[PDB]
């Protein structure tokens, strides 16, 4: 009965393609004709942080938009005071291979994970002074790539086992596992309400998960190569995904199909990080060409370039107050742009 | 004008000094990478030195060697192979008892990240390989194989086939047999050559 179910799947795929096509009447690009362009923007490196010796792989901004976290292959996970470029903590790591970092919304905990297939959670407000490893989660058969905090008790991680998992830090078990992806996943972005997230896999298909129910709800496939990073629109109805084929794409979950694409003929380097701004007008996008590009999210046109990194930027993220954007490249340099 | 930010600045300076000291202390050791197919004897060579990545640390003639064995995890090679850049050399391991190894070597030697790192190539199971060669020729494995059915010719052909999978003259491949525990001396000689090359290049003289 394999042929019958295969034919049913093909027919249903044709039906969903027809439904998606029938829901499209006009592209966003021509609708955005009336919008005046944002114009060229110039961003200067207000602050530069110099405390790392190896390649920086990931970071996260604090909730108060003052505190940073750093993750590098040197084995050090430092927390920066962005305004005064100070160091408040320096947490050594058991394994020097680190691929992600996370900052808790409450500012109490910090998570980390890399090629050791284990997510480590540190308590930064211990009564005994220094920061210690509060918990240690090990339930994946592959490297972790992204970690995000729902609450102080829940963490969602993206690993190399082609699955996404939701943990309960109080006891450290698999509360819910998310299966369905056929490739490695290295993208995570939780919606502002923190009840729904989207992850980007290597099969050129980012899927829309559900934290409560535990099952996938929507599947978006418009890319051609692996997904390197994903971000969620501040509204919560759209999200942007950066792939390895040197292009970014803006999907919408309510319309459940493409809206616009961001590509340039001169750009050949693949995307590494993608983020938005407070209003969603600007789409910051890291590149492997040692620079970051600022795209007009509505006009699908380039607005400016923020260069100044010797090596490729492996991380990028704007502040919660939308006052600065921080980029960290492989040259162990973090720069704050305002 | 800092009221009590002076104490925070002092703490930051202490943290920076500690980080600099740790980096200086941790830059003296040399990092080596391990490759090869499943059950290729790389664990055997690691034991001869006496869950994703396993780390082995030893010392030999006042030089700390760190060995990274990665084959314990199954994932996409290119998804994490960039994390292993700047490694001094790649200690490839080949078992002469079983084309997958050739394909892996050809894919890893021409990688963009490893366009300059030296490759140390070890051929294992020499005795049983010789016994198998005396038992039967390797024409089944290599349909284009020509020559006698001796041991030296077969080993030379295998070494040439492995070594003919690179296109960068700047990258050198060292080859040796194994299975007196003196391969550590070979690794030390190769790493000293690599250190000399790196120092000369960094001095602007090479």
């Amino acid at each position, epitope marked *: 009965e394999l042929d019958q179910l295969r034919q049913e799947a093909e027919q249903l795929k044709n039906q969903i393609r027809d439904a998606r096509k029938a829901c499209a009447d006009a592209t966003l690009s021509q609708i955005t004709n009336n919008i005046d362009p944002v114009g060229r923007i110039q961003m200067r490196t207000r602050r530069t942080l110099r405390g790392h010796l190896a390649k920086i792989y990931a970071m996260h901004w604090g909730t108060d938009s*003052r*505190l940073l976290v750093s993750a590098s292959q040197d084995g050090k996970l430092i927390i920066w*005071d962005s305004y005064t470029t*100070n160091k*408040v*903590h320096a947490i050594p790591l058991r394994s020097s291979w680190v691929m992600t970092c996370a900052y808790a919304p409450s500012g109490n905990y910090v998570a980390c994970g890399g090629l050791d297939n284990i997510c480590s959670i540190y308590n930064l407000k211990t*009564r*005994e*002074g*220094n920061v210690r490893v509060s918990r240690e989660l090990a339930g994946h058969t592959g490297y972790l790539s992204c970690c995000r905090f729902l609450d102080d008790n829940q963490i969602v991680t993206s690993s190399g086992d082609t699955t996404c998992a939701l943990w309960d830090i109080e006891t450290g078990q698999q509360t819910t596992t998310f299966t369905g992806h056929t490739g490695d996943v290295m993208s995570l972005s939780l919606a502002p309400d923190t009840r729904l997230f989207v992850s980007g896999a290597c099969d050129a298909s980012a899927k829309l998960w559900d934290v409560r129910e535990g099952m996938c709800r929507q599947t978006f496939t418009g890319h051609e190569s692996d997904i390197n990073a994903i971000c969620f629109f501040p509204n919560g109805n759209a999200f942007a995904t950066g792939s390895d084929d040197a292009t970014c794409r803006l999907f919408d979950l309510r319309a459940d199909q493409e809206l616009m694409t961001y590509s340039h003929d001169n750009i050949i380097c693949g995307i590494t990080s993608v983020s938005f701004s407070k209003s969603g007008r600007l789409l910051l996008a890291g590149y492997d060409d040692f620079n970051c590009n600022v795209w007009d999210a509505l006009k699908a046109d380039r607005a400016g370039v923020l260069a100044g990194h010797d090596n490729r930027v492996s991380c990028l993220g704007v502040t919660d107050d939308g006052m600065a954007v921080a980029t960290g490249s492989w040259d162990s340099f973090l720069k704050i742009w305002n | *004008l*800092s*009221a*009590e*930010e*002076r*104490a*925070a600045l*002092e*703490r930051s300076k*202490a943290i920076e000094k500690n980080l600099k000291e740790d980096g200086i202390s941790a830059a003296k050791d040399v990092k080596l990478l391990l490759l090869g197919a499943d059950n290729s004897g790389k664990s055997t060579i690691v034991k001869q030195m006496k869950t994703g990545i396993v780390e082995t640390h030893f010392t030999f003639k006042n030089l700390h060697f760190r060995l990274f064995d990665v084959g314990g995890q199954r994932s996409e090679r290119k998804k994490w192979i960039h994390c292993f850049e700047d490694v001094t050399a790649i200690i490839f391991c080949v078992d002469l008892s079983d084309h997958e190894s050739l394909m892996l070597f050809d894919s890893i030697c021409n990688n963009k990240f490893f366009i300059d790192t030296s490759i140390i190539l070890f051929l294992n199971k020499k005795d049983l390989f010789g016994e198998k060669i005396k038992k039967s020729p390797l024409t089944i494995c290599f349909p284009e194989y020509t020559g006698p059915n001796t041991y030296e010719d077969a080993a030379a052909y295998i070494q040439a086939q492995f070594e003919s999978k690179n296109r960068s003259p700047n990258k050198e491949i060292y080859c040796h047999m194994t299975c007196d525990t003196n391969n550590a001396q070979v690794i030390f000689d190769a790493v000293t050559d690599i250190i000399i090359a790196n120092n000369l290049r960094g001095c602007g003289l090479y």
Partner: single-chain antibody
Framework: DVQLVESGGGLVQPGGSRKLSCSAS????????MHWVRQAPEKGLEWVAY????????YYADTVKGRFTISRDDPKNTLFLQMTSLRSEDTAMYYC??????????????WGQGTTLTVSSSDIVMTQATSSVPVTPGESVSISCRSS???????????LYWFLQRPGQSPQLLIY???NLASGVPDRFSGSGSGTAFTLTISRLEAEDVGVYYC?????????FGAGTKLELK
């Protein structure tokens, strides 16, 4: 738990010498600045000395310069004070405290037990208007502390610390930066004020809150405490 006990006090002849050792166990002593605080038998707390992390900077009070010496020993995790040239006014009970500094830290969180010294026979001044008021349980009362200089720094946060000394034990930190509640403190405590007039407001007073309260200016050394506002039951 964190333990912080001092020893070395006793009877000292006028002009004699002594040593005070504050032994610490339970926390990373190598990264805490440590002060010494002196309290007269019938007066408020007074500052003595200070050391930084790694013995970087050493600070002293006005009337103490050149009198004693304070040192740190990280291997043994002990703070030392060199009791030298004890005058008639040096007789009091001494405390040792934790003073970790970083962005968001809470200095003076933990206070030592105390040792008694017995001897035979520009600075910011902070005044507390009231000295003692009755307070029935379940009522709301506010204590006031007024400074001399403006304690609101240019960086944004003003430095005002509120301490509570329960009768019979060491003082405990209540409020730091006059806006944040210390760890392990009930939410019924609150603090407010602006520039120079500060106040601490308590609601639903309980029997465990009777004591005396002190206000300290941490904007610049030396740190000056207050006379103290006393609360009494009924």
């Amino acid at each position: 738990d964190v333990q912080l006990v001092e020893s070395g006090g006793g009877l000292v002849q006028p002009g004699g010498s002594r040593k005070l050792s504050c032994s610490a166990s339970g926390f990373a002593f190598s990264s805490f600045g440590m002060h010494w605080v002196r309290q007269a038998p019938e007066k408020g707390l007074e500052w003595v000395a200070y050391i930084s992390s790694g013995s970087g900077t050493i600070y002293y009070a006005d009337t103490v310069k050149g009198r004693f010496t304070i040192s740190r020993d990280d291997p043994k995790n002990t703070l030392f004070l060199q009791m030298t040239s004890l005058r008639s006014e040096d007789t009091a009970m001494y405390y040792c405290v934790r003073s970790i500094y970083y962005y968001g830290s809470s200095p003076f969180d933990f206070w030592g037990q105390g040792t008694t010294l017995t001897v035979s026979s520009s600075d910011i001044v902070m005044t507390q208007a009231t000295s003692s008021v009755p307070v029935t349980p379940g009522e709301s009362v506010s204590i006031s502390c007024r400074s001399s200089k403006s304690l609101l720094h240019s960086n944004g946060n003003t430095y005002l610390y509120w301490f509570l000394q329960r009768p019979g034990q060491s003082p405990q930190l209540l409020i730091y930066r006059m806006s944040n509640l210390a760890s392990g403190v009930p939410d019924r405590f609150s603090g407010s004020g602006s520039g120079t007039a500060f106040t601490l407001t308590i609601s639903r007073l309980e029997a465990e809150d009777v004591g005396v309260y002190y206000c300290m200016q941490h904007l610049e050394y030396p740190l000056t405490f207050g006379a103290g506002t006393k609360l009494e039951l009924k």
